[PDB]
């Protein structure tokens, strides 16, 4: 089976419309995939301590951690940028009101395997060799008992483009820590700050070897291999955004005087306090939108920028990403800043390497604590410097430290919205974290698989010993190899249709004038996926 | 809350050739994991 081909190419994305309004949206994804001979045969347990973790100030810095580094290559398809294009993205979310998770299956094909012969006579001249014979090491985890590692918070997923070669990454995963911080410094003090590391509680050490785990296919030329159908049991995702806030809730309080002259300039009037009826949950015979009755608390102040300390160090505290609000503040609305990558979006030409750019959902909920506040005892309209704590009162002494940094107002009440899909540098379907108790989400994607996620594609490629022997030595000697081999994954997911309902139209993402240019090669070949908004439909909350 | 044996349960009596036997009660209990974590925020994921 030489000259034969096993697989077929196909980067389509066929949008089937069926019955009452729903889409099978069949994402193919075909791409030559490029692996080279993984340098070092073993599995290395390797820790990992930076200067700057321990210095005065700097701890936020901190990069400590023990790697188990594998000679795995692992191949994440996980991110969106893998399965659409600008287009598509536009297609779904100006009109899908909800997407979901179905069936996946990926596929390796048309393998080839390459030596590489030195010739350095007199110029260094290099021979290209096809070792018929030698092999691509393939593994399938199908049930995930090496520990899971998301490639996508990474961007070292797969090729975001199909007339782009692309590789997968080196599989190292983390192993158990004793990190120590004692104790946290500011910027400036002088104090001997203690910064160690020496692998974990020996009961928490967790050794796994692919070998030892999953059985592995050996791939020559003329060979072939494909991940099974695997179905997702996952929570539909929105693809809408909720608007209404607390102070948006149920019925509005009649006015009493309607404007009378054009002009949002002129508003009309409510009848003073104390006249108004209905509920309260304060004491005060007076009715105040601020302090008016509401079905629940919508968003929540989750305490921003909090480090907390448990055996493999200090780290921030997650806070469920959230629209800003009128005071762009981010950082405490879970803003997330991703990074690109010559191959995740970002002219591929540029100079400069990577991209920035900083992510908001659309649901608003997020808040603007550079605004909270709380008021003493009765309550009482007009406050008492004594009894209302303020967005700029310092806090355990500390000048700029406002009670905002601690507060957290999660409760029962809370009513919550889920991530965004984030088109394109966004992970897509998500390990459940295997604890007692289960999360209500996570931050990382928007879906998260109620059982058994798919499965982690390995990749490495077969040792090309040489007549060196091997055994009774250190690292063994062998050929240089490396491959070139393609690979189609099919991602399906299940939607909904929009509806006129309302009005006015709505927000709905364009092209205009001064932007085609991020949708259109350059004269030399450059490319761009700049990321965009998702959930861009409005929808009722109440 | 005021509780009495005698009012809320049937009590039996037995002597010393007596014999009393619960029924056979089921529970409805989620499973007990005998298994302990380690990973942390610090260890979750795609090392760098």
Redesign the interface.
Known sequence: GVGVSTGTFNNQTEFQYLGEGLVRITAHASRLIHLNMPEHETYKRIHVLNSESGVAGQMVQD?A?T?MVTPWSLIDANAWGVWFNPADWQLISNNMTEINLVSFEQEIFNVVLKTITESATSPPTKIYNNDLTASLMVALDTNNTLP????A??S?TLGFYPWLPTKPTQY??????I?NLNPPTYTGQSQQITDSIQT??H??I?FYTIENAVPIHLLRTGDEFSTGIYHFDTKPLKLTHSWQTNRSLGLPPKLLTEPTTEGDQHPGTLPAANTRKGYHQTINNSYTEATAIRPAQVGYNTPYMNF?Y??????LT?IVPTADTQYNDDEPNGAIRFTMDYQHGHLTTSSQELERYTFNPQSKCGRAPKQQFNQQAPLNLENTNNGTLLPSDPIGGKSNMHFMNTLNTYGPLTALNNTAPVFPNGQIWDKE????LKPRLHV?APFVCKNNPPGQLFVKIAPNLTDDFNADSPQQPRIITYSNFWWKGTLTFTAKMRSSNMWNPIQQHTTTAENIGNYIPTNIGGIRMFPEYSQLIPRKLY
């Open positions: 990069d951690h790697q899971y590692t998301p490639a918070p990474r070292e190292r995963y983390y192993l158990s820590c990190r974990g509680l009961s928490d967790m907390e448990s055996n493999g160090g200090p780290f997650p974290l295997d604890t007692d990382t």
